[PDB]
Ligand binder design. Sequence first.
Ligand SMILES: [Mg+2]
Lengths: 50, 456, 50, 38, 73, 333, 43
Amino acid sequence: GIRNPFTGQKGNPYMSFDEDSAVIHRMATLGVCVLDPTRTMSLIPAILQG
Amino acid sequence: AGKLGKFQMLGFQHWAPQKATNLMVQLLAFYRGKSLDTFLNSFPTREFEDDNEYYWDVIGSSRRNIPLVEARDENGVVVAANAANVGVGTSPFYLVFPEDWFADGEVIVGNLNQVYPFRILGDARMEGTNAVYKVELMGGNTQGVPAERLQQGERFSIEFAPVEKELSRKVGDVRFTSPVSMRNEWTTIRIQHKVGNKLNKKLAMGIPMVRNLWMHYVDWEVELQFDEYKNNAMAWGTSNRNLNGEYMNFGKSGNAIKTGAGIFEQTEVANTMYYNTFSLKLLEDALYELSASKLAMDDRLFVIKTGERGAIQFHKEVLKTVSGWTTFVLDNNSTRVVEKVQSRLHSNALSAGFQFVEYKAPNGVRVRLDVDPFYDDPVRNKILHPMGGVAFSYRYDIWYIGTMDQPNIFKCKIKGDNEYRGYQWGSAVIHRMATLGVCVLDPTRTMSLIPAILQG
Amino acid sequence: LMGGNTQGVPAERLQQGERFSIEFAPVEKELSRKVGDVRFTSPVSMRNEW
Amino acid sequence: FFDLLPYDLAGNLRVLRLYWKSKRKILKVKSYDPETGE
Amino acid sequence: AMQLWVMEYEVTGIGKGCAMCKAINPQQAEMLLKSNGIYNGSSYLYKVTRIEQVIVPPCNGLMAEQVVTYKDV
Amino acid sequence: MVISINQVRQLYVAKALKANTAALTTAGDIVPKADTAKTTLYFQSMSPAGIVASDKINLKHVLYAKATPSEALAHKLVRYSVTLDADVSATPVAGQNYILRLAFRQYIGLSEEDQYFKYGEVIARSGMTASDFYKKMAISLAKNLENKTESTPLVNIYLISAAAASTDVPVTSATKESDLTATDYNQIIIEETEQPWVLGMMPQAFIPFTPQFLTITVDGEDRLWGVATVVTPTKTVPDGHLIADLEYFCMGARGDIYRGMGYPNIIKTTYLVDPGAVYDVLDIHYFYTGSNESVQKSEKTITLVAVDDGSHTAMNALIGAINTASGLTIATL
Amino acid sequence: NFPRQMLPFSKKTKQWRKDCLLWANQKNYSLVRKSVIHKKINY
Ligand SMILES: [Mg+2]
């Protein structure tokens, strides 16, 4: 709004909203890959129910 | 004492040939806004680290004397107002104090010092929080002490602790004290305006009362009208808390609007006074009793800060007091009410006129008079006085009582900058924000005579 | 009502004709929202001839 | 998509440099030359 | 903002007075005197004794007169 | 509130009296325990974290055991009756300035060298009688005195109607003179008020005052316009605020002396004194004397407090319990 | 309020110099330049 507590700035020529605040947003796109699951073996206790 | 309306200020909602002058004209038949800046810039500024509340030590004084709760006979019964003398023939009796302040063998004295001195015959038998001493008389008193001088509310001081020359045993003790402290809070100001150099909706047109009846600079107006928000929270601020500390006024986000006091709310907790008529009999006694107990004899210069019509109210009040001085006959050789001016019209030509600005009371109490022009405000002050004016110029103030070696009154500010600004486009809103405060250290060092028509 | 007032403003202080003047606009120390406004004036023209 | 000076951007730091003219008190002194009267 | 009204009144214990207002009705002509006159902080002192409209077509006439006397004080 | 000690003083809150040491089950119970030979008296009390005992009072080494009721500690607030001086003038003389100076002596200080003066002002009229002047003097006094925006309230202003003569009418800064309609007022009662109080930090004290008058001219003589006598008091401050400060002191001889100093890292003693109840106090002062050469007295004391309701039932039960256990002769109040 | 520049050399302390940089963080005023929004559209 009128100040950013995160980036330490007092003064906003392009204000977002009228409230004295600041909201930090983060986003990411991520993944994994196992090419051959026959090159990898598991052995699990069956009380974990899979 | 009568007016005549020379203007009328009406809003716009109830409403090229060549020009003579380009710059606008301000008539004398038009009131003007009055900045409190040079009243507020007369005080210094004490800079603070942050927005937290702050405290400071208040170091007081020591010389006590203790009130009496009651007095008792040797058989246990209390004394009355219609009783006879107590302790005849140096017979012992009892004496009840709310604290254990004296010791054994000490001499304590009543309201009549050194006539009826009371010697304490042992340690205080405690009763709840009270202290009961067994006392007898230390002055060769055969008649005793009367019951009038042994009632509730009688003050008792310590004198000494006399012993015998041979085989004396221990008497007396020493006493200790401790100081206190006080606090103060802050206040947060905001403004907005939806807009760029051109006007907006809130318009007031000024119509003069005569016989034959540009483009607006926004960023100078939103800087000035927010400065006047900052001046009014300095001077006309009010505290909205209980004696428990919970705020009473909640804002739009649910958080409580935290607002601290102003100058005229802090300074009017001590030595304030509402008078129905102004007279020097009141002012010279209100100024003496403060200076009889709190000031020396050379340090008694009281400078009245007031308005303009109160200065002629002080002028005509001194003149009535000098009118009652039948012993001294005032001549023009000394006072010079009538002076001689050189004029084209005459060889021996004169001038006439005078004004009292000073009054010097007994024992060195001197009174000055300077006029602060923001007391004559037509906007802020609307109750009118029948002698002409706004009835707030008829208010007297004494700032800076004595010498303190430190500013008693100052304006608070946060280190760095407590000002914020913002512009919100889409609606083109301009935002401003500021936090501030004012601290009066000793409000017993400011005296005020306010009119009684501005109370309640 | 604002200034710690707990017994209420009297009925004699709210009659017809009582003038009202702007002092200031307070908000909180935390998550404030917009208040206040700014006022203006327009001029009127006088007139003369030859 | 979307349907401010941070301290960091892509690993870089934020360097803000302020240059200002402050007011220094100095003395102007009138002295006499010992050799000639100047 | 309809008509003009000349009033004669009496500030209680202090003196006499003359006034003139612009109001729609004499209930509002007494309103502007008690709220904008010089006795604004002591508005119970006003005792209005006669309100009469300024009608024009005479174009020359007295409307108000009130002399305080050395025997009334 | 800090007090002085001959030597150490312990206070035990007797909320309920049981008969044996096993029935101590709720916070505040007490049992005066002794022997069958009456040679040692001690008080087992249920502190809020377990059973505690007091010191062991050898009954041969007692000095006094007295009990003080609640009205004997309750402070009476002093009043001042302001009248017109009868020898000067029984009526207000016209055109004079009547100023009453209230002289406070212990304002914002512990000493009589911190003074404070509040004034009231009435100018008189030609047909102003004595009853109308007392009405006008009280409005102008309370407008200065009991503003809402002061530091602390100082004194209360009351008028007395001659028809009533025992019921006072209150006047404040909010009271207009249309409310006071009685035509026979005879005095102006100025009564001191109960100062603020927080336990431990701000003890209970009062600001005394005497009213003084400025001189007026009635027949060309500068005469004081009134007289002010002190009547017998009618209002009394209850005993609750003295004992909650007394327990806050005396729970640091048993408990902790750092009563909250380094604020999160502290010990909090639970206090069982309610400041909205009046109390009676029992003081047992006694000593200890050693074996052969340690014959010095160590004069300590044990304080007992109990809430009373009119006739003191809980304190006189406590005195009756000690008198049969210890065998003393404590007087029954 | 940019802090006071009318000071002795000794009263221009380390906190006083730090207060100057903190005013630069709260942020241009020039009347012979265009806006940053204008020059970035040109670029
Ligand atoms: Mg003051």
